[PDB]
C-alpha cells in the first residue's frame with residue numbers, strides 16, 4: 001500500500017505513539033535535520049497522571065488531552081499521523097498502520113517505539129467485560145459513567161440487597177492509580193454527592209481497595225505505604241490486602257485471601273488497575289529480532305534502548321524493560337529524549353564511535369491519596385500530608401499545556417478542594433456502556 | 448411493577464424531562480405543598496443553545512450540562528430520577544420508565560410533560576446513519592469526532608478525489624443550528640487548524656449549507672436572513688438554498704433543487720439540523736386522548752397547556768404546539784413556569800374558578816453566525832454584526848449555572864475569539880462511531 005505520508009530525501013524518523021516518550025522525541029528533533037512521522041492511535045497527548053480527575057468529574061478532557069497536531073504546529077519537521085500501528089517490519093523497515101479501514105505502510109530510516117503499556121488481568125482477560133481498566137479517556141469517561149450511574153440506579157432500587165450491591169465500589173490494585181481512585185470515589189460519595197439523594201444516603205457507600213500485594217504503594221516503601229493506608233482507612237476506604245482476585249462477575253468479585261480462605265464481595269461498579277502489560281507490538285519485535293521479553297512482555301532493550309541487531313530501532317517508556325528504570329512519566333520522557341538525541345547526534349556530521357548507555361536520573365516519585373494528603377519520596381527525604389499534596393499539584397500543573405489550560409485547571413482545583421462542587425459530572429449511557437455493548441454484539445456476530 | 452421513587456401522602460407531581468420546561472417547573476414548585484418526581488433520560492440539564500460550542504471544541508460538557516440532581520440539591524421536596532419514560536398511562540395515572548432493564552411505574556396526581564423535540568429526517572430516517580443530528584452531548588461529541596476525523600483522514604489519503612470528498616463538510620438546514628455549525632466549521636478549518644497540517648491545507652476545505660427554504664433563518668425575516676447569508680458567504684460557506692435532499696450516503700448527498708435539476712454533493716461529514724419531530728410520547732397521548740398532533744407530532748394542547756379531558760396533565764416546551772409560540776428556550780421556560788404556577792395555585796386552595804390562558808411574553812430572538820457577527824431581533828428593532836454578537840454572548844452566559852462555569856466559559860471565549868486556539872479538540876473513535884457501529888451490529892443481530 002501507499003505510505004500514507006509525505007516523503008523526503010533526508011533521513012526519515014518514524015515515532016510510534018503520542019505519549020511522553022514519542023512526543024518528547026518529536027520535540028527533541030525540532031531542528032535535527034530529519035523528516036519525522038509521528039504515528040499515534042489517537043490525536044491527543046494524554047497527560048495520564050491527571051486522568052483520575054477526569055474519571056471523577058474534576059476536570060475536562062481538554063485540560064489533559066491537547067491535540068498533538070496542535071502542539072507540533074510550528075515544527076515543520078514533524079507530520080502527525082493518526083493510525084493504529086498493526087505491524088512493524090524490521091527487514092523492509094516499514095511501519096504498517098490502519099485508519100478507519102485504510103492501510104498504510106510508512107517507511108523509516110530510524111524508528112522510536114513509544115507505544116507504552118496497559119494494565120493487565122493476568123490472563124483472565126474476560127474480566128475486562130466487568131472491571132474496566134482506566135488507561136484512556138474512553139476508559140476515564142466509562143468509569144465516570146459507571147460510578148455516577150451506580151448511585152443513579154441505587155436511588156430507584158427498592159430492594160435493599162441490590163442497593164447494597166450497587167453502593168459497594170471495588171477498586172483492584174493498590175498502586176498509585178488505585179489509591180487515587182479509591183480516594184476520589186470516597187470523597188465523591190461522602191462529600192460531593194452529600195445531600196443530593198432522597199432515597200439512598202451516599203455516605204453509606206462502601207469503597208473497597210483490593211490488592212494481592214502485602215502493602216499499599218509498594219514503590220514508596222513501607223513507611224509511606226502505611227501512611228497512605230492510614231489516610232485511606234481514615235476516609236473509610238476498606239483496604240483489603242493479600243487478597244487475590246479469582247473471579248469476576250457483573251455482580252461482584254470472588255477473592256482468595258493469603259490464608260487460603262475464599263470469599264465474595266458483591267459490587268456493581270468495579271475498577272481494575274493491577275499489573276502491567278506492554279503493548280502487543282512487543283511480540284512482533286520479539287519474533288523478528290529475537291529480543292526477549294519480560295513477564296508483562298516489555299522489551300528488554302539493549303543498554304542504548306535499541307533492539308539487538310537493529311541499532312536504529314529504539315523502544316522507550318513503559319514498553320521498555322530498562323533495568324532499574326521505573327514505569328513513570330520521567331522514564332518515558334528521559335528515554336525518548338535519549339533516543340532522539342542519539343538520532344540527532346548521528347545524523348549530524350558528528351559520530352561517537354560508541355554510544356554512551358542510557359542513564360536514568362531519578363527525580364523522585366509522588367502519589368496523591370486525598371484532598372490535602374499525598375505521599376512523596378525524593379532521595380533520602382520522605383514526606384507526606386498537606387505539603388506533599390501541594391508539591392504534587394504544582395509538579396503536575398507544570399506539565400499541562402498552555403497557560404489558559406493551567407488557569408482553568410487551577411480554578412477547577414480551587415472549587416473542588418475549597419468547596420466540594422465538581423464541574424464535570426456529565427455522564428451518558430453511551431459513554432458508560434458502548435464498549436460492553438459492542439463487544440457483546442461482536443461476540444454474537446462472530447457466530 | 449413497583450414505583451421507582453419514595454412514597455408521599457401529599458399531592459404528587461411528576462415532571463418528565465430535565466430540560467428548560469421540566470427543570471423550570473421543578474424550581475417553581477420549591478415552596479409548594481407538593482411532592483415532585485423529576486424523571487429524565489439523562490442526569491444533566493443540557494443548555495442546548497451552546498451545544499455547538501461543544502461540537503466544535505470551544506467548551507467542555509460540564510460547562511453546559513450541570514447535573515440536575517445537583518441543581519435541585521437544596522430542594523427537599525424534589526426527587527430527581529434517571530429513566531427513559533417508555534409509557535404514560537392517563538387512566539391509571541402512572542408513568543412507566545426503564546433504567547438499565549429495570550422497569551418502574553411512578554404514580555402521579557399532576558403530570559408535566561417536557562420531553563421536547565428532536566430534529567427530523569422527514570420520511571427518510573435511515574439518513575440518521577450518515578447525517579448525525581446534533582441534539583445531545585452524545586451528538587455534540589460525535590460531530591466533533593467526525594469533523595476533526597475528516598481532516599485526520601484527509602491528511603493521509605493519497606487520492607485527491609477522496610481528499611475532496613473528505614474536506615467537503617455538508618450542513619443540512621439553515622435554521623439557527625445550521626448557521627451556527629456552518630460558521631464554526633468554517634472558522635475551524637480556516638483559523639484553528641491553519642498550519643497544523645502538512646499534506647492538506649485545511650483552508651481549501653468546502654463548507655456547504657443546504658436548505659429547501661428560500662432564505663436563511665426564515666424566523667428572522669429577509670433583512671437579517673440576508674445579512675447572515677452575506678456573512679456566511681464572506682466566510683466562504685457555499686450557501687445552497689432551494690435544495691431538497693433526496694438521498695444520503697456514506698459518500699455524500701444527492702439533492703433535487705427548485706430548478707428541478709439533480710446534483711450530487713460528494714461529502715464525507717454531514718450534519719443534519721432540518722425540521723422538527725416531537726418526542727414519540729405524543730403518540731401515546733394521542734391514542735389515550737382526543738388530542739391532535741402537528742405534522743411534527745407536537746401536541747396541540749388546550750389554551751391552558753392541558754390535554755383535553757385531563758385538566759392535570761400539561762405539555763410544555765418544544766413538545767407543545769401552542770399557537771403563536773416559537774420553539775425556543777423562553778417558550779419552554781414560560782410554559783413550565785405557567786404549568787407549575789397553576790399546580791401551586793390549585794393545590795394551596797387558591798384556585799380560580801377558571802384558569803387564565805397561557806400568554807407567551809415574546810422577549811425577542813437572536814442567532815449567532817460567526818466570531819464577531821450575529822443577528823438579533825427585539826420587536827421593532829433589528830440589528831446585526833458585532834454588537835448583536837456581544838449581546839448574544841452576554842445573554843447566553845447569564846443562563847449558565849455556577850459562577851466558575853461562567854468564568855471558565857468566558858475564558859474559553861476569550862481565548863477562542865481573541866486567539867484562535869480551542870481547548871477541547873479531544874476526540875475519540877468510540878465517541879465518533881459507537882452509535883452507528885452499535886446500530887449496524889444490532890441490525891446484524893436482528894437476523
Ligand SMILES: Cc1cc2nc3c(=O)[nH]c(=O)nc-3n(C[C@H](O)[C@H](O)[C@H](O)COP(=O)(O)OP(=O)(O)OC[C@H]3O[C@@H](n4cnc5c(N)ncnc54)[C@H](O)[C@@H]3O)c2cc1C
Pocket residue numbers: 016017018019020021022039040041042044046048049050051052083084085086114115116117134135176177279281316317318319327328329330332366367
Ligand atoms: C491513571 C494513571 C496515573 C498515572 N500517574 C502517574 C503519576 O502520578 N506519576 C508518574 O510518574 N506516572 C504516572 N503514571 C504513569 C505514566 O502515565 C506512564 O509512565 C507514561 O504515560 C508512559 O508513557 P509512554 O510514552 O511510555 O506511553 P503512553 O504515553 O502511556 O502511551 C503511548 C502512546 O502510544 C499510543 N499507542 C499505543 N499503542 C499504539 C499502537 N499500536 N499504534 C499506535 N499508537 C499506539 C497510545 O495511544 C499513546 O498515545 C500514571 C499512569 C496512569 C494510567
Ligand SMILES: Cc1cc2nc3c(=O)[nH]c(=O)nc-3n(C[C@H](O)[C@H](O)[C@H](O)COP(=O)(O)OP(=O)(O)OC[C@H]3O[C@@H](n4cnc5c(N)ncnc54)[C@H](O)[C@@H]3O)c2cc1C
Pocket residue numbers: 463464465466467468469486487488489491493495496497498499530531532533561562563564581582623624726728763764765766774775776777779780813814
Ligand atoms: C443546536 C441547538 C441550538 C439552539 N439554539 C437556541 C437558541 O438560539 N435560542 C433558544 O431559545 N433555544 C435554542 N435551542 C433550544 C431549543 O430550540 C428549544 O427551544 C429548547 O431546547 C426547548 O427545551 P425543552 O423545555 O423542550 O427541553 P429540551 O431541551 O427539549 O429537553 C428535553 C428533556 O427531556 C428529556 N426526555 C426526552 N424524551 C424523554 C423520554 N422519553 N423520557 C424521559 N426523558 C425524556 C431529555 O433527556 C431532556 O432532558 C437550541 C437547541 C439546539 C439543539
